[PDB]
């Protein structure tokens, strides 16, 4: 499963923003941090 991540329900265990499984919450909660930032897709070629 690489593409096509959607459905009906909530997954407070694994991050949905990107989709990455963690081992310990400690690291899980932290991950969100990076997400907090703008996290812009990216500029156009050039
Ligand atoms: Zn994420």
Swiss-Prot record:
C2H2-type ZnF: 13-35
Localization per Swiss-Prot or TrEMBL: Nucleus
Superkingdom, taxonomy of origin: Eukaryota
Chain's role: May be involved in transcriptional regulation. May have a role in embryonic development.
Record-stated family: Belongs to the krueppel C2H2-type zinc-finger protein family.
The protein's name in its UniProt record: Zinc finger protein 28 homolog
Organism whose genome encodes this protein: Homo sapiens (Human)
Portion held of the full protein: 696 to 728 of 868
């Amino acid at each position: 499963g690489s593409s096509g991540s959607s459905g009906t329900g909530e997954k407070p265990y694994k991050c949905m923003e990107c989709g990455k499984a963690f081992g310990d919450n400690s690291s899980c909660t932290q991950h969100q941090r990076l997400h907090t930032g703008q996290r812009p897709s990216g500029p156009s070629s050039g």
